[PDB]
């Protein structure tokens, strides 16, 4: 059923599984019209679909054309998500298809279940974790590919760069979420932390700097302090 | 007018006949029910005084044979039976009528309640829902399960209602996932009406029968079935105008007839609020919404 802190290690067992997050599928800017009314202007989006064990990100880019002439876009967006996810599953060889798809929002449950009626053996589940995946558009390379897309497009990433060579997926996933949580609580400070240093570079084929193990410890500590800081600034503690 | 005579009443029992009901004391001189209106199905039902567990009873149509009730002390229930000897049956019944040992079916001449609750219900269709082909009447009780319940255990004792599932491949066209899930017209009109029921009178008959079995037997699966069938219409944007008008009247009389004290269990709050206030047909059930709001406003 649902997914919480009791069964946290299940993410990193050997049953294929994917997170699906739809919080950046439909994006708008809100602005005034000449007549002084308010209007939205959509911008490109994406579906964040992530194997937590391997780091394989399947970034489906949602080009604003997909909304042209449509109504109830917040609702269409969940169904379009579910459709893109189903389409993905159907494109993977059977031995690559997930046994479980975990959605980060419960409003995705029905749209995905309906679209996956053909796959009765794939379990569609919610989670009680507050995962910070909405912050995915704070990763510059992922933001850049979304905003430059002129058509629908799927781009594949490994969201853990090369970390798994040195750490467990359990530890890589936890670094990832600390990073995302920080980016979501204060993007400037978090980005200040990651990239003021020249010595540390982001390889052309990576998303995050090339930190040594010791430098990651320092980074990780700085992100924890950031999160705690903003929590004080927020609640005056 | 026809008769359902009884051999005797050896155990104390509350007897129902359609929407009416009366108590018989253990070994009271009761020999059955007379003056039953020809032209409708009927249901005769039982709740033993000593064990309110198991309400049970029989659906029948007096046009289809001569039926009597005999207590079976081995199986512990009042059993419906058919007498194929027409003359012998007339000779026994006439003795009982001359000794006034029968309760009269108490129909008021202004009252169309039973008709309105059974307008589309026909014995032939009951007998396909309740499979026991050697008898012309159908036994139902509270514990009987439905085919769909048997999929979520004896197949012979089941209620074979039509299976309705909104998250099923039957209900959802490849490529119309969103349209078909948010508007059930395809499922209602093409799958169920055109394909399965053939017409709206058969659909309404199952719906009415589902409801009557929920009300008289507390049969949970029938209640589920009544509500599913209502929800499928109310969640379709495209329903023939005559169907909605008839549904409004059907439901109206079913809400009118429900015992006030069984409302909490026989009526699904989610389905009714959705149907009356959110669904495509939210403005189309004027009579039903008006009685629901004046009789059970707590549920809403
Ligand atoms: C053993 O009884 C019969 O077989 C029978 N046939 N008709 C009736 C009865 C019982 C008395 C009521 C009417």
Distance in angstroms (rounded) separating the CA atoms of residues B10 and B73: 9
Q: Under an 8 A CB cutoff, do A111 and B172 touch?
A: no
Fold match between domain A9-163 and domain A164-237 = no
Taking CA atoms, what residue in A is nearest to B165? A114
* Angle, helix A213-235 to helix A169-185, in steps of 10 degrees: 40
Distance in angstroms (rounded) separating the CA atoms of residues B288 and B250: 9
Distance in angstroms (rounded) separating the CA atoms of residues A108 and A79: 8
Residue A101 and residue A122 in contact, taking contact as beta carbons nearer than 8 Å = yes
Does residue B168 belong to the interface with chain A, where contact is any CB pair within 8 Å?
yes
Rounded distance from Cα B21 to ligand 1 centre (Å): 23
Q: Under an 8 A CB cutoff, do B181 and A114 touch?
A: yes
Q: How far is CA B87 from CA B66, B84, B90, B94, in A?
A: 10, 9, 5, 11
In Å, how far is B178's CA from the nearest CA of chain A? 6
Atom of ligand 1 at shortest range from CA of B92:
13
Per residue in B183-207, is it b (16+ CB within 10 Å) or e — as a string? bbbbbbbebbbeeebeebebbbbbb
Enumerate residues preceding breaks in chain B (C to N > 2.5 Å). Answer: 152
Domain B116-299, CATH homologous superfamily name and number: Aar2, C-terminal domain-like (1.25.40.550)
Q: What is the DSSP string of chain B?
A: -EEEEBS---S-EEEEETTEEEEE-TT----EEEEEPTTS-EEEEEEESS--S--EEEEE-GGG--EEEEEETTTTEEEEEE---HHHHHHHHHHHHHTT-SEEP---TT--HHHHHSTT--HHHHHHHB--TTSSSEEEETTPPBTTGGG---GGG-B-PPP--TTSGGGS-TT-HHHHHH-THIIIIIIIIIIIISSHHHHHHHHHHHHHHHHHH--HHHHHHHHHHHHHHHT-S---HHHHHHHHHHHHHHHHHS-GGGHHHHS-HHHHHIIIIISTTTTS-HHHHHHHHHH-GGG-
Long-range CB contact pairs, B288-295, < 8 A, 24+: B288/B247, B288/B248, B288/B251, B288/B252, B288/B255, B291/B252, B291/B255, B291/B256, B292/B255, B295/B255, B295/B256, B295/B260
Distance in angstroms (rounded) separating the CA atoms of residues A162 and A159: 9
Distance in angstroms (rounded) separating the CA atoms of residues A33 and B179: 32
Please name the residues between 103 and 122 in chain A that touch chain B, using a CB distance below 8 Å: 110-111, 113-115, 117-118
Experimental technique used to determine this entry? X-ray
Task: State the fold for domain A164-237.
Answer: Acyl-CoA Binding Protein (1.20.80)
**Does the C-beta of B7 come closer than 6 Å to ligand 1?**
yes
Rounded distance from Cα B213 to ligand 1 centre (Å): 27
**Does the C-beta of B205 come closer than 6 Å to ligand 1?**
no
Q: Which residues contact B65 (CB under 8 A, 6 or more apart)?
A: B82, B136
Please name the residues between 26 and 85 in chain A that touch chain B, using a CB distance below 8 Å: 76, 79, 82-83
Backbone phi, then psi, for A32, in 5-degree steps? Answer: -85, 145
Atom of ligand 1 at shortest range from CA of B83:
6
Domain boundaries, given as residue ranges, for chain A: 9-163, 164-237
- Give one word for B54, left, alpha or beta, with left for phi > 0 and alpha for psi -120 to 50: left
Residue A67 and residue A26 in contact, taking contact as beta carbons nearer than 8 Å = yes
**Does the C-beta of B137 come closer than 6 Å to ligand 1?**
no
Q: Under an 8 A CB cutoff, do A111 and B168 touch?
A: no
Distance in angstroms (rounded) separating the CA atoms of residues B209 and B226: 8
CA-closest residue to ligand 1 atom 3: B83
Distance in angstroms (rounded) separating the CA atoms of residues B150 and B142: 15
Q: Which residues contact B50 (CB under 8 A, 6 or more apart)?
A: B11, B12
Q: Say which DSSP state A116 is in.
A: T
Q: Under an 8 A CB cutoff, do B177 and A113 touch?
A: no
Rounded distance from Cα A5 to ligand 1 centre (Å): 69
- Give one word for B136, left, alpha or beta, with left for phi > 0 and alpha for psi -120 to 50: alpha
Chain B hits for A118, CB-CB cut-off 8 Å, are: 169
**Cβ–Cβ contacts within 10 Å for residue A111, how many?**
27
Chain A hits for B167, CB-CB cut-off 8 Å, are: 110, 113-114, 117
Distance in angstroms (rounded) separating the CA atoms of residues A217 and A175: 10
Cited resolution, angstroms:
1.6
Q: What is the DSSP string of A164-224?
A: GGTS-HHHHHHHHHHHHHHHHH-HHHHHHHHTS-SSS---TT-SS----HHHHHHHHHHHH
Count of A-B CB contacts under 8 Å: 22
Task: State the fold for domain A9-163.
Answer: Nucleotidyltransferase; domain 5 (3.30.420)
**Does the C-beta of B32 come closer than 6 Å to ligand 1?**
no
The separation between the first and the last C-alpha atoms of chain A, rounded to the nearest angstrom, is 37
Listed in order, strand segments (DSSP E) in A23-63 are 27-32, 38-43, 45-50, 56-62
| Edge-to-edge order in the sheet of strand B138-141 | B20-24, B13-17, B42-48, B56-60, B138-141
Taking CA atoms, what residue in A is nearest to B167? A114
Residue B210 and residue B201 in contact, taking contact as beta carbons nearer than 8 Å = no
């Amino acid at each position: 059923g649902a997914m919480n802190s009791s069964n946290y290690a299940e993410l990193f067992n050997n049953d294929i599984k994917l997170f699906v997050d739809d919080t950046n599928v439909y994006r708008v800017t809100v602005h005034k019209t000449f007549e002084g009314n308010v209007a939205t202007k959509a911008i490109n989006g994406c579906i964040f679909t992530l194997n937590p064990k391997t780091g394989h990100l399947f970034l489906k880019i949602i080009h604003t054309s997909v909304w042209a002439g449509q109504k109830r876009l917040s609702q269409l967006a969940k169904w379009k998500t579910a459709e893109e996810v189903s389409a993905l599953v159907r494109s993977l060889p059977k031995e690559e298809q997930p046994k479980q798809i975990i959605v980060t929002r419960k409003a995705m449950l029905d749209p995905l279940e309906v679209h996956m009626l053909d796959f009765p053996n794939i379990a569609i589940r919610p989670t009680e974790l507050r995962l910070p995946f909405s912050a995915a558009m704070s990763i510059d390379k992922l933001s850049d590919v979304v905003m430059k897309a002129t058509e629908p497009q799927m781009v594949l990433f490994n969201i853990y760069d090369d970390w798994l060579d040195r750490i467990s997926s359990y530890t890589a996933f936890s670094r990832l979420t600390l990073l995302l949580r920080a980016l979501k609580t204060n993007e400037e400070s978090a980005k200040m932390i990651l990239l003021s240093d020249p010595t540390i570079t982001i390889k052309s084929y990576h998303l995050w700097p090339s930190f040594t193990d010791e430098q990651w410890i320092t980074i990780e500590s700085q992100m924890r302090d950031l999160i705690l800081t903003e929590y004080g600034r927020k609640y005056n503690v | 007018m026809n008769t359902v005579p009884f051999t005797s009443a050896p155990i104390e029992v509350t007897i129902g006949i359609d929407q009416y009901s009366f108590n018989v004391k253990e070994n009271q001189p009761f020999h059955g029910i007379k003056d039953i209106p020809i032209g409708h199905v009927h249901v005769i039902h039982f709740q033993h005084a000593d064990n309110s567990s198991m309400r049970y009873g029989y659906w029948f149509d007096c046009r289809m044979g001569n039926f009597y009730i005999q207590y079976d002390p081995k199986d512990g229930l009042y059993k419906m039976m058919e007498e194929r000897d027409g003359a012998k049956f007339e000779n026994i019944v006439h003795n009982f009528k001359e000794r006034q040992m029968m309760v009269s079916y108490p129909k008021i001449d202004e009252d169309d309640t039973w008709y309105n609750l059974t307008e589309f219900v026909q014995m032939d269709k009951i007998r396909k829902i309740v499979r026991k082909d050697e008898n012309q009447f159908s036994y139902v009780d509270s514990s009987m399960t439905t085919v769909q319940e048997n999929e979520l255990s004896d197949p012979a004792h089941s209620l074979n209602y039509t299976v309705i599932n909104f998250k099923s491949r039957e209900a959802i066209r490849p490529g119309h996932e969103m349209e078909d899930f948010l508007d059930k017209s395809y499922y209602l009109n093409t799958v169920m009406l055109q394909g399965i029921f053939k017409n709206s009178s058969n659909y309404f008959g199952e719906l009415q029968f589902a409801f009557l079995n929920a009300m008289f037997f507390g049969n949970y699966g029938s209640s589920l079935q009544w509500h599913a069938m209502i929800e499928l219409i109310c969640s379709s944007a495209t329903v023939p105008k005559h169907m909605l008008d008839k549904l409004d009247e059907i439901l109206y009389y079913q809400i009118k007839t429900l015992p006030e004290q069984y409302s909490d269990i026989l009526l699904n709050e989610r389905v009714w609020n959705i149907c009356l206030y959110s669904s495509f047909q939210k403005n189309s059930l004027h009579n039903t919404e008006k009685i629901m709001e004046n009789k059970y406003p707590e549920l809403l």
